[PDB]
Protein: Mannose-1-phosphate guanyltransferase alpha
Organism: Homo sapiens
Amino acid sequence: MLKAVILIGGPQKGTRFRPLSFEVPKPLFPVAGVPMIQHHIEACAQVPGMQEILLIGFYQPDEPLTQFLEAAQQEFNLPVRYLQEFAPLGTGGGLYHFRDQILAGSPEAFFVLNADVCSDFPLSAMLEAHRRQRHPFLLLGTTANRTQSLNYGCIVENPQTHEVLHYVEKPSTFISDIINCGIYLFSPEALKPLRDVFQRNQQGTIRLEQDVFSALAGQGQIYVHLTDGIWSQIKSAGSALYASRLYLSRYQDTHPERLAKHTPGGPWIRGNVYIHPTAKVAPSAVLGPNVSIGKGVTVGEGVRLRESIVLHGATLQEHTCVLHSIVGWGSTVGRWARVEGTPSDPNPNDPRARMDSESLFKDGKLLPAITILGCRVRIPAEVLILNSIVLPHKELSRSFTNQIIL
Amino acid sequence: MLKAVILIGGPQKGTRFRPLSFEVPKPLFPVAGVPMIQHHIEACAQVPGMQEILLIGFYQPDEPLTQFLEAAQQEFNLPVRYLQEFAPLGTGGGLYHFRDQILAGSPEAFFVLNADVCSDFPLSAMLEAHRRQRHPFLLLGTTANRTQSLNYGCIVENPQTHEVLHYVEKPSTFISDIINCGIYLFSPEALKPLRDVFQRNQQGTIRLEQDVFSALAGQGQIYVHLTDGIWSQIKSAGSALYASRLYLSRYQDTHPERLAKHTPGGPWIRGNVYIHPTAKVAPSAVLGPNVSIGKGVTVGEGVRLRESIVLHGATLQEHTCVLHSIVGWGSTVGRWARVEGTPSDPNPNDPRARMDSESLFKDGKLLPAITILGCRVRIPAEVLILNSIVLPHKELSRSFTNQIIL
Amino acid sequence: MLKAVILIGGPQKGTRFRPLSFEVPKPLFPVAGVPMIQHHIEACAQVPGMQEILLIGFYQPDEPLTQFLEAAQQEFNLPVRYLQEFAPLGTGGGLYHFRDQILAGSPEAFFVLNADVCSDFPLSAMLEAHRRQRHPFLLLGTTANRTQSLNYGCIVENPQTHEVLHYVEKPSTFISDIINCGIYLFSPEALKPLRDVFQRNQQGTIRLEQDVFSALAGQGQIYVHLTDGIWSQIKSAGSALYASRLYLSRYQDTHPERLAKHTPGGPWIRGNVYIHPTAKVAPSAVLGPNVSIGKGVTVGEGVRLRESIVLHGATLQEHTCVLHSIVGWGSTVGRWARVEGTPSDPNPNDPRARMDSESLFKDGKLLPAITILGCRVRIPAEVLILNSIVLPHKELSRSFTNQIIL
Amino acid sequence: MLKAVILIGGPQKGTRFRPLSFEVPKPLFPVAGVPMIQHHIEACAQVPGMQEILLIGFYQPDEPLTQFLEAAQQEFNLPVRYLQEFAPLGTGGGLYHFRDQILAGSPEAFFVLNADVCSDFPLSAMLEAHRRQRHPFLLLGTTANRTQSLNYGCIVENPQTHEVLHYVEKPSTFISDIINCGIYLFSPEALKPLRDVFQRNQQAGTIRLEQDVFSALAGQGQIYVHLTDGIWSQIKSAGSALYASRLYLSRYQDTHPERLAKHTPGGPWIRGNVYIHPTAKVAPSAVLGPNVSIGKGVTVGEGVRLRESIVLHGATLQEHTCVLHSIVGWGSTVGRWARVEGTPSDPNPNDPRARMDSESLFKDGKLLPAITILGCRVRIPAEVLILNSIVLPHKELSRSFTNQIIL
Ligand SMILES: Nc1nc2c(ncn2[C@@H]2O[C@H](COP(=O)(O)OP(=O)(O)O[C@H]3O[C@H](CO)[C@@H](O)[C@H](O)[C@@H]3O)[C@@H](O)[C@H]2O)c(=O)[nH]1
Ligand SMILES: Nc1nc2c(ncn2[C@@H]2O[C@H](COP(=O)(O)OP(=O)(O)O[C@H]3O[C@H](CO)[C@@H](O)[C@H](O)[C@@H]3O)[C@@H](O)[C@H]2O)c(=O)[nH]1
Ligand SMILES: Nc1nc2c(ncn2[C@@H]2O[C@H](COP(=O)(O)OP(=O)(O)O[C@H]3O[C@H](CO)[C@@H](O)[C@H](O)[C@@H]3O)[C@@H](O)[C@H]2O)c(=O)[nH]1
Ligand SMILES: Nc1nc2c(ncn2[C@@H]2O[C@H](COP(=O)(O)OP(=O)(O)O[C@H]3O[C@H](CO)[C@@H](O)[C@H](O)[C@@H]3O)[C@@H](O)[C@H]2O)c(=O)[nH]1
């Protein structure tokens, strides 16, 4: 018997992902058609013997969250429950504070998953290593580029014994090539170190990486497990496009019916394209690679979309070109209007990619990134939105280039 | 009998050059301690025979606005009402649509005041000139620079009879130096030409400057009353701060009990400083020139505040320096933290410089201006915020420079 | 060219519709599957030459209302605008205040409807009756029971010239059999008497029935039109069920595809039943007469529904019996539960029908009426709810009988 | 060092026997001028060595609750924290789930309080009688009527050793003459039996305190009683809220003699015990009867009679109104010559120990006459009578209603 704990953030952790997030929490953002935590829930429900799934966060319950829970319970034939912390307790304080709800039923091991990561989720292979070793902490890790590894948690391991010799969290200088994926496997004895940290804080927030993983490393408690599958973290609004591309390329092996076929009677389609069944697409339109269409989306007659997410309720009139952009809920694009962005993804393996910054401006000028359109944005006809971020419920009158429209 | 009509805007029409407040309406933004239209309401209540005050604008009636109306009605002992347009009808369209509510009671004349101007309001002088000549339109006029005049509406007049011979609205070329100040006096005959404009629109929305003033100019219907006192327009954040400086310097002649005295036992005050009675300022704090403190603000030990505006409920901890910045309500600044902005101001060599306002991006580069902190923004300890706009409900963790922090 | 003005109420008028008015506004409550003003809009759009439909009411434009406007414009190919009053101006004060928007384009005539009536809407026949006489006010009137006529406004008419000699609004004692149907037809200078009332109020709210109709009665200005078609008014929660019965019986003449077919595969159907296409009904279920089913409704095995409205999102489990009840949005009825009401139709021809007081209690006992279940009300298994009103977001544990659950 | 735990409820678990507060949460409803739990917090401030106050309950945190928390924190010089359960965990499950936050700082004993009781709060006397024997559970208990004790939880006590031998929760038959107050004193080891109950459930983690812990440990030397004679009623419905406001206003003359309004011949006429907020503007022709509370910003007109009422903040009574036995919600307006009346059931006058029972809305399928509730922003027109009636919020009336619930 195993269960899974998905750490979703609160409303403050979603402020980095703020322009898109006003309408819905960051874990309920539709990445490649389905919500972000739904990939985690589905990959946990595909594991044999999963009894329950608990979501630990400090979001207040509203209709999006509980509607998602009521949908996912009947979809995956599993109880999906939401435990709410009273305060922001850190990454590990929420795991320790709900220890009775986690250990209820006495599970043999429980997974712990960050909500922001888009990954392969090879939970079965981690389970087959964990049944071989039966050790308190198992960490999914992956190799990253030497300049990109400084932003993630670095793990120095011994290659023969698969054990964390050392752990440094977001180091200033180079430590190791392997990074922490943010997916862990916990034994039931793994709540015994966390408890000690709680006692040390009184003589009630526990950060899992900086307190548990750093001190426990090298003493035989923490073991690594390396995957070579796809991994990325969704920390910003423009990283959701790259994670959606990763999921749409992953979709061939898992869900071949989700990607749209070419359909020579219907709209021309190149690359991997997800189209929702409710979405009305004109047959004159062509959809380039890595494109997701939401439910109830009307796409006009002659429209080009490439590397773009069109959220649900949005409306694209005819003759428009949308490259590298996220069109929010109910947003309207007038005819002959181009909405462009420049490609930029975390891409830890790659050296060219600009690494994580909360800044967004280099020296008083906006960095080239993914164009975001918030909720209910009315773009007029024959107008260009290039490299630009538009706040919700804003109608534009002329063409904006490289600006944030407040 | 006279009433006065204040043209408060709508939410879309504000389109702030720097957003002084993301969550409160622009006409309720506290300039020099009291809300922006409370200056208009008070200067209108000083005029003899003022029966009523109307506010025309298409804001939806949120409880802050109605609560302000509750306060102002019993403060000035005048009925203050809010008439909401059904749609954005333009500057003069809302006057014509609500002609039955303004004309009821048969006023002798009625004022029309823009909500965004910060002025002397010499309404009695305009009333004396209007009682002398009884002409239908009276316009306040001010003298401006040759470069700065292209932003306002220029007025060419006959200098002897003080009648407008030509009017032009934001011209591309230089026309005249006198600018319209957004303060007018309307005789009851003056709703008759507006009606004429409405019929030409059928062959809804009437722009008062472009359709009434710029068409009837020279035909003996529009007269300009020149004036001398302080005038600025509250378009952006920096112009709001400069208007607050103008009102704090004006307070010496009218409300000497509003400015904080020197008070050697309490906190140090240089220059003109408004401190609310409910705000508790530590006696080691020193508040520089042109500083407004709101209700419930707890300015800590050792704080320096220069050229700032602190909204209600913000807390500043020990040893913090706040220069040229607007602090949103409920915001927390940690100890040794510095919030700085750049005062664009007005030229010191120009004879009549009117302090222009620029919309956030010079030529595709973000320009340095007043630092805006949103509502409930937590600035952490020992950190620097420089030339930044911080969106609400965001807790920072590192120093930011020349950035819009989403 | 004709126009049509529908006086939807405000939030003050929907209070007599409280259980169902907490979630949606009153004019958007679905009567016989479609919203209450959709019947008005479709019967006005079937009239040839109709240009525009205006809705006058002091509701705030919430996203349900604006979403209905956007949907109705593209459904009926007719522009539907919503003109919002600044204050509650009565039945005719809003018609006078928006006179320029109503008379825009010089329409030949414009209908005036009340949003709460449920009727045949024979606007074509009223137009043909209008075009011969060409009089300012054309009133629709029907025959009613002498007991029931004291609740509606009464019209004493001349049989020879079809003219209102006498009008009494809500009479104490009996005056005439004919009652006002709440549908009017207005000629262009019929707004000229209305203006006179405004001037008489200056020594501006205009009640249309008491100030205009009762004053102009007998002066040759008001004319009657007599109808035999179906008519009811929806003033209360239980009146919407009777109006749904009348509209489902009217559907056979106009929209025979909306009624559900008997269906060998489908649930046994007697009488008039509307089922939405998205709704899912088990084959063992049986839906009796006058039953409307909303979208997304899951009806379990062996359910019996008779004279009930099941709004959208509601789930009824197995073997449940529901009679004379209104099931709220997302309200859940557990298995074997019986939700029963007693029929209290308004029915102005019927002599023993109730007076439609808003009292709901006779002498401390709740009168038998329709069983309203609020929005998101969960009913447990094997629990009877008889003649009750359940407020929204409630969860019950035991059987209630003749009670308001607060 | 002590701390105190106040078990405020949640929205659903109340099931208010008369729906007094349609949008203000039940702990924050003002009883005798200040909020209902503030009387707890004030009393918990007077105990020496009191560190913290924890409010455990499953209301979502929003503006009225957190505004009250900030105001009470800066007023009483105490840290007041709100701990929120994820689900309704019941009376003892709240104390078990948040046990790390309760035991932090190692308190020597902690008080547990029901939030709906209006009481004397004799916390220091309980503390002395606890320190003499040092036992895990100490229960405040009072004497009650023989037929009225079936609503409360009854306690069978040994008179010599002051120990419970049998606790029954809301019994049908008669059990004992002593009832549980809802004020408890817990040892640090008092969380040790609670854990046992949690383990017994594993062979939503919800522990009812009174039915599991107290009815299991009874007669084993764990639970002891403390008998008091001071004032006690439980604020379950609206009528008991008026009676609790009366008890607190009569008790105010010892603790807070400055809160009751004086007779003040220059100001309004006052008989009985009246609380008047400083912001409230009352004309001098108004005469305010006994047991009347006035919230902040209330403008009471000329000639207004107010008897046995509670007027929440921002209400407006125009001239010549008469308001008896009713609760006027916040922001609501009553026009001139309008009479708003109710009927107070009270306690039996003959019975020697009679407490107010909070009857439900319906006696026998019919509405029983009780206190008149006006919701918030209710506009009562001029010259109209509301009698024994409940008006839902944001309603405008035009005629006189009697014995009705107006939706
Ligand atoms: N319950 C709870 N959950 C939280 C909290 N704070 C964050 N979470 C969730 O915890 C996960 C990570 O939290 P972060 O603090 O934002 O860490 P990070 O900057 O994203 O980096 C972590 O994950 C990376 C991979 O995504 C790792 O590479 C890195 O080492 C570290 O583990 C996210 O799902 C976040 O929503 C909290 O206070 N309480
Ligand atoms: N009711 C209503 N009011 C409006 C609307 N649009 C603007 N207002 C209000 O009308 C005032 C001026 O509107 P603008 O159209 O933005 O004028 P401007 O660019 O600011 O310049 C005007 O004022 C200057 C001084 O402030 C003048 O110098 C200039 O001539 C012009 O009149 C502002 O307070 C604005 O809030 C509207 O559609 N409806
Ligand atoms: N815009 C606006 N609409 C209003 C207002 N007040 C009422 N309405 C709308 O006006 C219509 C009737 O208003 P009532 O005042 O409640 O009249 P009534 O009790 O329904 O009786 C009227 O209608 C009956 C049939 O519906 C008639 O039988 C009767 O004669 C009378 O005309 C309803 O659609 C209501 O929503 C208002 O202040 N503003
Ligand atoms: N944290 C939390 N608190 C709760 C919960 N449910 C109720 N409370 C609070 O616990 C207190 C009592 O809970 P009840 O279950 O309603 O008990 P009761 O019917 O009022 O009777 C109790 O109190 C009486 C006197 O107040 C006692 O006579 C009786 O013995 C019993 O203890 C009230 O403050 C209630 O708000 C809950 O699920 N979680």
